[PDB]
RNA sequence: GGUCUAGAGGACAGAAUUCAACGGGUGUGCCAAUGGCCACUUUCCAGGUGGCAAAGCCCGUUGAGCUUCGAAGUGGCACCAGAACCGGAGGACAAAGUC
DNA sequence: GACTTTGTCCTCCGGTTCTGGAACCACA
DNA sequence: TGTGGTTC
DNA sequence: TGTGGTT
């Protein structure tokens, strides 16, 4: 309900050794403690226990099993009874189990399925299970904190309240299993930990009437906190197991019920495949199983063979599938799947039915996820170093132990922490001691922190850049951690400690005691996804109640009502544009006098959504310039150079094979060709490696195999050992090298928060693996050791780089929504200014079905995880919560390929650079200058500089303006996607006013295209309408209500095709025609 | 100034373009930002493990020397975490088949 | 550079389920 | 504003 | 090319 904010702070223990001894001595406490009841629990529980299997990484063992459990349960509670001196009866075994098992059910409501409070189940239970005289549990005591309905009755009134308060009590059976337990000689269940042979520590001695310390209760609570959760996860993963086995037979018989034929078809396919490959020896159960990855684009491979003959020869089948490969090579699949599809034999699978591969690859899925898929969720007990949790320490007031923060206690900046209880060392015995204070090493991050209330120690104030007035909060709970690497060490010395203070902050609208903002009942946020919902019929009294007035910053979100929609990108990271919402009674603007852009708002006929500006919001290192270009270049020079020369060697590597066939298949592509044309390796290396080929062209044939092969492996040493001084001189340079480094705030950098140089990062791990484990035996494969780390320090550099582009990325975000833009002055050189009144709401695409899938190239995957556009939104959501601003997400299809203004569809663009049409020294045509140039066959004509080239994927969109040929729409492609999130949010945009699914079928005695009816949208227009045609393309509309489905498609604007539905396939080629075919016509004269 | 609208911090193309001493401090990191030496890992490289060492880093003041108008300028940025768990996918290696 | 199949190892991205209390009464 | 057992 | 990203 309220922002937390975690302050990790660090601890100077330098000048005093034995409260740091004190602080790791209190850590493995706190472990051993949670550990004792986290086993406890796990015994009155008795089922079955899972843990990690070892010697592979998969599946799972049963560490102990249920007998295992409840054999030992009775071990401890027997030893229980004797030692708690018990003479009254002791229960059978069976009574004792199942009394043990409800006091679990009590303790883990989650392993029945019911909802618990860690925090009031340990408050409720550890006296009673642990002090030999507790009265807790019971209805014996009259303290603790008064009911609900007795608050109310001394003021609020207490009838419904007061009924509950008995109702909740009678099906209450805490009473009953304690009184059981005492009966049966378990009064004390368990030890409280520290007062108990298990910890050598000196604690302070127990007071009268008291058992427990608050160590105990710290250690009590993070036992049923672990066990609860995971018990929620062992209910969640036998569900879930549980909805598959029912999604496997819920499939065959309903998907291929009459295609009984094809499925033993397909299992022949597949091993004849198993059977026929030269790979590795097949180990799963779905070894060589058709997936959708293998049968990415075979919906083209297959209408290009219908209109072939069944009897034709191989290489019209193949060469049809090299044509759709061709065409684009990162959306297809396996040749050899086609190939093997394309054989007689096998021909029926997609000839009968050509949507049956697809689907029996989703069962095949379904198979290999089940194969797979656990059934119980692991239960692993905590350890102080290899899996630690860390002790707590309530703040000032609180049950726990606790600590105040000392503002300024030693310096200016030099704050410090008071423990009120902790543990000291001295000469190795640990005593419990009193009220140690203890300096935080010097934080910037803690100058956000200034003191609120003398007299109240807990309360602060929050500094941020995007705030002009300091949020008031409190100080919360600390835990006391340390670093995972100094943790599973010992050694012999004096191992940072950290504290993590939780920072409670609360925001100006929650200072004003309302549940949420007054602009919160204008948008409704749905769903996990936070999908954006605009109350029509409530913006237009909340305009006349909160009309704009000009306040900047956070001082205006009370006035206005502002949207900013963001479009996320690898190029540019947060593409924005903002909308106010204003009368249409408005005027022309400051700068020359033109009508502004503005959206319709539905509903409100006064009202429109006025556009006020459009930024690229681009993280450092996202522009380009000749001199960055070059830097770019060079920095991955010789990188780029050992990449093709390791190639080579591999190449020199299969010539030494036992293989003969594979070794001169292998030299033959040596010595066929000159080394290196393109000039892509190092003079002295290739200089090296041409010295080794000849010398072995000289001894090919003439020699024997044992002695020709024993020469290759020799001049892969000295080839090998050659490149491996230049592999250590590389990485010297990387790491000791002396580059440029920027002072201050500086523009244009070379890598900066880009994805490229977090790319430049991953390129040299990859190309460092590849070195590591390449083989000079040809045919071994070399994987990592069971638990080895490659390049520990790089690994956390791209991750720490991860992490800080994705916390400045969500801020950019936050500060523009909020109306703060970082300028340069110079005489300040560079701080925050409230420039813009604020927006209320940030507006996202919705990109969570964007997800990575093994249907996506991997490729295509690869990007999802260095753009990782969710973890932006997460980001987002966390980082907005203290200023009051609302992020929604957008629905996105078509987000980017329909024209924001317009409303027609386009094809995103580039455009050609400068640099290729100067006639002084012009520079290569890039990549996707050369893939147009060659699909037109454009080779003799002159391209002029900015001439508009349709590649599909440029960060230009284009869209047909008018019928007049030529005539286009050209803006920035981002800026167009979030004018388009914009345009989606003031107009309830459905998918159905522009696509619609259809399958055909009889209605009024004529084949037409019945609308597939999904969601309420598309059926409160589109149930009591069919669609009819006269050509197959260009359908039209009724009203009365083959076998694959038809898509159609719609241009909004009616420029294309008028505007009618047309196929999809025709649809975006006459949008193709628009634009490509007049780009090309007029570059051809 | 050329191209393109959204008319904005507009967007594309182009033309243009660090020592020293002393004092204090070194939370997590990033910005061209991936520490150094030794030993071990059979072997040289990569990677790892361990050991050792001084610092390297910022901030301030006083000097120099640079570089633009005697003055100024020799650093900027972000930070909500903890544990366990279930998934989704990358990466590397070998064989084979493909643009 | 891009793409597929086989296995096995290290890594990363996304989401879940717990969490980072409050207050009364007898104490001696 | 104590703690420690106790109830919410 | 055809949801979203962009070699």
Same mark, same amino acid.
């Given at each position: 309900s309220m922002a937390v904010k975690s302050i990790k702070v660090k601890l100077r223990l330098d000048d005093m050794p034995e409260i740091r001894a004190g602080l790791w001595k209190l850590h493995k406490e706190v472990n051993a403690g949670v550990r004792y009841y986290t086993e406890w629990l796990s015994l009155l529980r008795q089922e079955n226990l899972y843990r990690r299997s070892p010697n592979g990484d998969g599946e799972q063992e049963c560490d102990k099993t249920a007998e295992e459990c409840k054999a030992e349960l009775l071990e401890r509670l027997r030893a229980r009874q004797v030692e708690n001196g018990h003479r009254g009866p002791a229960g059978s075994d069976d009574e004792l189990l199942q009394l043990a098992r409800q006091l679990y059910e009590l303790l883990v409501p989650q392993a029945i399925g019911a909802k618990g409070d860690a925090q009031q189940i340990a408050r409720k239970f550890l006296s009673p299970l642990a002090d030999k005289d507790a009265? %807790? %549990?019971? !209805?014996?005591?009259?303290? %603790?904190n008064k009911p609900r309905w007795v608050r109310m009755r001394e003021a609020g009134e207490w009838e419904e309240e007061k009924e509950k308060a008995e109702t909740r009590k009678s099906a209450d059976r805490t009473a009953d299993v304690l009184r059981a337990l005492a009966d049966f000689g378990l009064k004390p269940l368990m030890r409280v930990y520290t007062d108990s042979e298990m910890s050598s520590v000196e604690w302070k001695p127990l007071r009268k009437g008291q058992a427990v310390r608050t160590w105990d209760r710290d250690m009590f609570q993070q036992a049923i906190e672990r066990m609860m959760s995971w018990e929620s996860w062992n209910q969640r993963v036998g569900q879930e197991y549980a909805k598959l086995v029912e999604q496997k037979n819920r499939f065959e018989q309903k998907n291929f019920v009459g295609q009984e034929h094809l499925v033993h078809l397909v299992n022949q396919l597949q091993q004849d495949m198993k059977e026929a490959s030269p790979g590795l020896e097949s180990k799963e159960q779905t070894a060589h199983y058709v997936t959708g990855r293998a049968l990415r684009?075979?919906? @083209?491979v297959f209408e290009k063979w219908g209109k072939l003959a069944p009897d034709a020869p191989f290489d019209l089948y193949d060469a049809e599938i090299k044509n759709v490969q061709r065409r684009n090579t990162r959306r297809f699949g396996s040749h050899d799947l086609f190939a093997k599809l394309a054989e007689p034999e096998y021909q029926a699978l997609w000839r009968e039915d050509a949507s049956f591969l697809t689907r029996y690859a989703v069962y095949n899925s379904i198979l290999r996820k089940l194969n797979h898929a656990k059934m119980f969720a692991t239960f692993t007990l905590p350890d102080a170093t290899a899996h630690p949790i860390w002790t707590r320490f309530d703040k000032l007031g !609180?049950? +726990?132990?606790?600590?105040?923060? +000392?503002?300024?206690?030693? !310096? #200016?900046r030099r704050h410090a922490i008071r423990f009120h209880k902790l543990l000291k060392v001295e000469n190795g015995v640990a005593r419990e001691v009193d009220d140690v204070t203890v300096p935080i090493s010097m934080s910037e991050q803690l100058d956000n922190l200034l003191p609120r209330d003398p007299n109240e120690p807990i309360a602060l104030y929050f500094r941020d850049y995007g705030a002009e007035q300091h949020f008031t909060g409190e100080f919360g709970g600390a835990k006391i951690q340390c670093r995972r690497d100094q943790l599973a060490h010992m050694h012999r010395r004096r191992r940072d400690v950290y504290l993590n203070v939780s920072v409670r902050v609360q925001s100006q609208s929650e200072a004003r005691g309302e549940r949420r903002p007054p602009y919160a009942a204008v948008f409704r946020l749905v769903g996990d996804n936070h999908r954006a919902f605009v109350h029509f019929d409530k913006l237009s009294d909340y305009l006349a109640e909160h009309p704009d007035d000009g306040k900047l910053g956070s001082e205006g979100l009370l006035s206005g009502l502002r949207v900013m929609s963001v479009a996320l990108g690898l190029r540019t990271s947060a593409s924005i544009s903002v909308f106010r919402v204003a009368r249409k009674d408005e005027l022309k603007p400051n700068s020359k006098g033109r009508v502004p852009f503005f959206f319709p708002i539905k509903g409100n006929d006064n009202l429109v959504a006025v556009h006020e500006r459009s930024? &690229?919001? @681009? +993280?450092?290192?996202?522009? #380009?310039? @000749?001199?960055?270009?070059?830097?770019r270049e060079e920095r991955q020079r010789t990188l780029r150079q050992l990449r093709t020369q390791l190639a080579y060697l591999r190449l020199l590597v299969r010539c030494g094979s036992e293989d003969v066939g594979r070794?001169?298949?292998?030299?033959? @592509? &040596?010595? #066929?060709?000159?080394?290196?044309?393109?000039?892509?390796?190092?003079?002295?290396?290739?200089?090296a490696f041409e010295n080794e080929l000849q010398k072995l062209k000289s001894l090919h044939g003439i020699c024997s195999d044992k002695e020709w092969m024993d020469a290759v492996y020799e001049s892969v040493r000295r080839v090998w050992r050659h490149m491996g001084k230049q592999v250590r001189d590389w990485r010297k340079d990387v790491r000791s090298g002396e580059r440029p480094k920027i002072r201050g705030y500086a523009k244009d950098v070379? %890598?900066?928060?880009?994805?490229?140089?977090?790319?430049? &990062? #991953?390129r040299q791990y990859k190309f460092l693996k590849s070195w590591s484990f390449f083989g000079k035996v040809s045919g071994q494969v070399i994987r990592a050791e069971k638990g080895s780390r490659f390049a520990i320090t790089l690994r956390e550099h791209i991750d720490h780089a991860k992490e800080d582009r994705l916390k400045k990325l969500a801020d950019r975000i936050i500060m523009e929504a909020l109306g703060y833009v970082y300028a340069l002055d110079e005489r300040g050189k560079g701080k925050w200014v409230a420039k813009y009144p604020p927006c209320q709401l940030i507006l996202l695409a919705e990109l969570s079905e964007y997800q990575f899938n093994n249907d996506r190239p991997p490729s295509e995957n690869n990007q999802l995880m260095q753009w990782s556009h969710r973890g932006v939104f997460q980001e987002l959501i966390n980082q907005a919560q203290v200023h009051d601003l609302l992020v929604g997400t957008m629905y996105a299809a078509f987000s980017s390929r329909f024209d924001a203004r317009t409303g027609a569809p386009g094809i995103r663009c580039r455009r050609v650079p400068a640099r290729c049409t100067q006639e002084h020294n012009p520079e290569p045509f890039p990549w996707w200058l050369n893939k147009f140039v060659v699909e037109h066959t454009l080779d003799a004509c002159p391209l002029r500089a900015d001439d508009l080239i349709p590649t599909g994927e440029g960060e230009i969109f284009v869209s047909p303006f008018s019928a007049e040929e030529g005539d286009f729409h050209q803006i920035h492609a981002a800026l167009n996607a979030a004018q388009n999130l914009q345009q989606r949010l003031w107009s309830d945009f459905d998918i159905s006013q522009i696509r619609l699914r259809c399958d055909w079928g009889e209605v009024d005695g004529e084949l037409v295209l019945i609308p597939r009816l999904t969601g309420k949208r598309t059926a409160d227009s589109y149930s009591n309408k069919v669609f009819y045609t006269n050509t197959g393309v260009t359908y039209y509309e009724r009203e009365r209500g083959r076998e694959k489905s038809v898509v159609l498609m719609r241009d909004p604007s009616g420029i294309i095709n008028r505007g009618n539905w047309t196929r999809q396939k025709e649809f975006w080629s006459m949008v193709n025609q628009r634009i490509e075919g007049y780009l090309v016509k007029q570059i051809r004269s």
């Open positions: 009265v %807790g %549990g019971l !209805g014996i005591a009259k303290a %603790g684009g075979s919906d @083209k !609180g049950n +726990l132990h606790q600590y105040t923060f +000392l503002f300024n206690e030693f !310096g #200016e930024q &690229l919001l @681009k +993280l450092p290192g996202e522009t #380009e310039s @000749k001199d960055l270009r070059a830097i070794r001169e298949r292998s030299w033959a @592509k &040596l010595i #066929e060709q000159p080394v290196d044309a393109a000039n892509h390796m190092t003079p002295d290396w290739r200089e070379v %890598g900066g928060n880009s994805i490229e140089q977090i790319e430049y &990062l #991953e």
